[PDB]
Ligand SMILES: Cc1cc2nc3c(=O)[nH]c(=O)nc-3n(C[C@H](O)[C@H](O)[C@H](O)COP(=O)(O)OP(=O)(O)OC[C@H]3O[C@@H](n4cnc5c(N)ncnc54)[C@H](O)[C@@H]3O)c2cc1C
Ligand SMILES: *[C@@H]1O[C@H](CO)[C@@H](O[C@@H]2O[C@H](CO)[C@@H](O)[C@H](O)[C@H]2NC(C)=O)[C@H](O)[C@H]1NC(C)=O
């Protein structure tokens with residue numbers, strides 16, 4: 001049976017009549033022949049400068065990118081760039097690249113069954129997308145048939161008391177739940193949680209999918225320190241296997257599959273629905289806004305980075321005190337970042353469940369450590385109190401930031417013991433700060449600790465062990481030009497993987513990274529992404545998808561195949 005999937009233009013590729021008959025079986029209009037988002041910017045039959053300008057204007061918008069079957073928030077390889085003609089830009093070339101060639105706009109189980117079956121029947125690579133949010137190309141594939149789940153939406157329903165499809169009691173959970181009965185986004189789930197005065201533990205941005213890559217890789221957000229990571233919210237799922245069977249996965253049934261999807265990434269089956277734990281609303285949340293800038297701005301920014309190193313050392317104490325959230329910093333920035341300075345550190349942290357007085361005590365270990373820098377840095381610190389989770393969430397989080405660039409980042413979970421020696425930390429900070437000429441994004445995800453640590457007791461979970469000891473994640477990355485030569489991308493990828501990523505590993509060598517926002521070019525990605533759970537993830541992969549119908553890049557088992565950006569996917 002053939003080692004390589006069939007691709008367009010080959011003799012094995014179904015001819016126009018076969019595709020047309022497949023469109024008609026589905027329901028005319030469901031099969032979409034994909035077109036590069038910005039093809040109207042280029043010469044040929046599809047050229048349209050009005051369409052091109054609209055596309056150029058809307059490229060950075062998350063909804064615009066989720067609305068097209070091959071729209072990508074963080075496109076893995078821009079092979080058809082939008083062209084800004086008003087700005088004097090001119091076209092190079094436009095190809096599909098590694099984006100799927102056909103998509104099925106699937107809105108019923110029958111759509112999904114037929115798409116799965118057709119892919120297998122014609123040996124065509126099946127690509128699964130709920131939203132196209134992925135940063136690593138795991139919802140892409142050259143010459144692929146995309147199962148697009150964006151309109152597969154059969155309700156989001158609140159359960160006052162979790163009620164399992166197979167009456168499983170082994171979760172031990174008798175609290176409330178939400179049945180996410182479709183490939184909904186967090187926005188949709190949040191509306192129902194809010195209507196029912198409960199906390200749904202979703203992402204900091206509401207556009208990503210609720211039941212796909214987000215929970216399967218981990219899933220962080222404002223509420224995860226307090227209530228657990230996204231993967232650990234999952235009580236059960238309905239999943240269509242490669243063989244077409246629809247099965248329940250929970251503590252009582254196919255528990256190896258259930259564990260795999262809760263931390264082992266995508267590619268075990270097509271997730272049709274999940275049930276998630278939801279949590280009682282709180283009476284208070286206080287947010288802490290901190291900003292730090294140099295009094296004396298220089299290319300080295302020695303004092304700023306000293307303080308950032310110190311701040312990193314304070315995070316575990318903060319985490320132990322119920323503090324969570326996100327911090328952002330730059331050694332150099334192309335313009336004012338903190339007040340008047342073209343550099344600095346800023347964060348939005350919070351104590352869910354605590355009023356301001358307790359919030360101030362919670363961050364005291366950090367503010368006290370920062371008193372030593374009052375002569376050297378300008379530091380501002382404010383608190384905002386909210387009377388429930390949702391007013392807090394929408395005020396301090398619920399982000400819809402600009403997107404549309406390639407992601408080249410590395411992530412490293414940091415254990416407390418990696419931070420006790422200031423000099424080692426300072427050295428890590430020096431390297432990840434990057435070259436003063438090159439913009440380096442550095443981000444702190446203070447999203448673990450607390451309940452995430454506690455949920456180590458849950459052996460049904462598949463989450464990377466390092467989550468259970470690491471209260472926060474460091475992410476460091478750089479951009480590439482929109483139209484990027486191979487040489488420039490290899491230079492940047494090397495800085496991210498072997499300079500930035502390497503420093504982070506040296507700082508914390510016993511932990512790992514975060515697959516969803518992580519380094520897909522790391523030679524050691526298996527270790528980073530999955531850790532010691534990998535052998536068990538792989539077993540589930542080989543049991544439930546022996547033919548690797550759900551192949552994705554870096555996903556468990558992907559090393560048994562060779563992916564190309566411009567040719568057939570093949571088994572080794
Ligand atoms: C603007 C933006 C903001 C973000 N914010 C956050 C954040 O705050 N916190 C955080 O942790 N992450 C965040 N992410 C990252 C997100 O967790 C990952 O990109 C994740 O892969 C998104 O899953 P998705 O289904 O939405 O993406 P997709 O690209 O649709 O799919 C991602 C992967 O999951 C697979 N997949 C999707 N749906 C299914 C399914 N139903 N069954 C089987 N496999 C499936 C795909 O095959 C692919 O491998 C953000 C991403 C974007 C674009
Ligand atoms: C982005 O897409 C381009 C175009 O498909 C890829 O370039 C090809 O890469 C292979 C090696 O992997 C070469 O043998 C081809 O000659 C390249 N083609 C062209 C037209 O340049 C590129 O590899 C993709 N980048 C990534 C990181 O996936």
Ligand SMILES: *[C@@H]1O[C@H](CO)[C@@H](O)[C@H](O)[C@H]1NC(C)=O
Nearest residue numbers: 029030067069105106107151
């Ligand atoms: C996808 O299908 C739904 C109906 O199931 C329809 O409302 C929607 O507009 C379709 N989208 C596209 C892009 O064809």
